[PDB]
Amino acid sequence: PDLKNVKSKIGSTENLKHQPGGGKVQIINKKLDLSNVQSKCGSKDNIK
């Protein structure tokens, strides 16, 4: 009558390494350039 300790069929065997982990995000942006500036509403020559 000894069955020889029969094993299960068929399980979550494909999940045994699984968690799963998460990816990443980082946003974060670049500064625009506003260095092209000069005023016009005054005098630079006729002041002299």
Residues lying near other proteins in the complex (CB under 8 A): 12, 14-15, 18-20, 22-29
Which residue, 25 or 34, is less far from other proteins as judged by CB? Answer: 25
Which residue, 8 or 39, is less far from other proteins as judged by CB? Answer: 8
Distance CA 11, CA 23 (A): 28
Distance CA 9, CA 11 (A): 6
Q: How far is the CB of 13 from other proteins (least distance, A)?
A: 9
First to last CA, the chain: 118
Which residue, 1 or 22, is less far from other proteins as judged by CB? Answer: 22
Question: Residue 14 gets which letter from DSSP?
Answer: G
